[PDB]
Amino acid sequence: GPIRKVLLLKEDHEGLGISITGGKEHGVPILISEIHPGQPADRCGGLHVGDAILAVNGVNLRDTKHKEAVTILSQQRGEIEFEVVYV
């Protein structure tokens, strides 16, 4: 698919509201596997199960291990831009 950039707005106490799979060690991109009702990804829309997360706020996640990606994603605050493509 075409690359999209999608903004999420996250209150400081909440998570992004997604589950992810994949990563470098798995030979596949970081993939959104779940979108959690009522949480930022769900409320803002634009993200979907099956989207690959290529980058977040300018951090390239295309070659990061799963855990590295989790950590980077968990550190993001406030207004967060995802670069995604539907694979």
Partner: peptide
């Protein structure tokens, strides 16, 4: 399967 909630 590796899956993480964030």
């Amino acid at each position: 399967r590796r899956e993480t909630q964030v």
